[PDB]
């Protein structure tokens, strides 16, 4: 009755989407990063912000590009990796440190990367408000609210990129068609 059908990589083994797996834009098949050619980077759980095209669809040349991600993406990644932390998460105590730890590693613009901490705090506070649909705000008794959590169980929202088989794989096309930003 309830057997979950697991998708498979071309290697023949199953896998998890939010755990080192990417989907080809052209063929729409899923691949283990290891089962890819020269992809060897540890990936935070939920972080799939890449544009991938396999060797089959791209004339034998594997195509990977890292996306440029916004603060909401960083926050969703933060809350997704933490929570899987025995209800909510204090902004200053649990969310703030983690982003600071990973700021260097995250695919964001230099402005975001080198942004002052006070200006960063207010920017993060507002982002969580603008994205109230994804983030619940929690308040302690007789305390200003400092607690946040994902309103639902899901991983970071990531825009789907599906190309026609005959289309060029230019960064120009990806930005014109899908409104994406790519990390240089």
Residues that bind Zn ion (CB under 5 A): 9, 11, 24, 26-27, 32, 35, 54, 56-57
Nearer to Zn ion, 39 or 112 (CB): 39
Rg for the chain, CA atoms, rounded: 18
Minimum distance of Zn ion from residue 95's CB (angstroms):
33
Distance CA 53, CA 24 (A): 5
Minimum distance of Zn ion from residue 170's CB (angstroms):
17
Distance CA 158, CA 43 (A): 15
Are the C-beta atoms of residues 27 and 57 closer than 8 Å to each other?
A: yes
Nearer to Zn ion, 23 or 75 (CB): 23
Packing angle, helices 117-130 and 71-83, rounded to 10: 80
Are the C-beta atoms of residues 108 and 69 closer than 8 Å to each other?
A: yes
Phi, psi dihedral angles at 169 (to 5 degrees) = -105, 35
Nearer to Zn ion, 56 or 100 (CB): 56
DSSP bridge pairs for 23:
30
Distance CA 25, CA 130 (A): 30
Nearer to Zn ion, 51 or 57 (CB): 57
Minimum distance of Zn ion from residue 50's CB (angstroms):
14
Minimum distance of Zn ion from residue 15's CB (angstroms):
7
Nearer to Zn ion, 35 or 183 (CB): 35
Q: What is the largest CA-CA distance in the chain?
A: 62
Minimum distance of Zn ion from residue 149's CB (angstroms):
33
């Amino acid at each position: 009755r309830v057997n979950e059908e697991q998708i498979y990589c071309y290697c023949g083994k199953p896998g998890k989407f939010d755990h080192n797996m990417l989907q080809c834009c052209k063929c729409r098949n899923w691949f283990h990063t290891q089962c890819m050619q020269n992809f060897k980077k540890k990936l935070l759980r939920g972080d799939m912000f890449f544009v991938f095209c396999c060797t089959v669809c791209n004339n034998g040349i594997e195509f990977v590009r890292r996306m440029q991600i916004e603060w909401v993406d960083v926050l969703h990644i933060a809350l997704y990796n933490l929570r899987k932390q025995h209800k909510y998460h204090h902004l200053l105590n649990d969310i703030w440190p983690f982003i600071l730890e990973q700021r260097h590693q995250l695919p964001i613009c230099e402005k975001w990367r080198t942004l002052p901490e006070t200006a960063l705090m207010e920017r993060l506070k507002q982002t969580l408000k603008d994205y109230s649909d994804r983030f619940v705000c929690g308040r302690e008794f007789k305390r200003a609210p400092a607690f946040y959590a994902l309103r639902h169980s899901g991983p970071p929202h990531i825009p789907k990129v599906f190309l026609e088989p005959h289309e060029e794989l230019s960064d120009e096309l990806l930005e014109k068609r899908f409104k994406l930003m790519l990390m240089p």
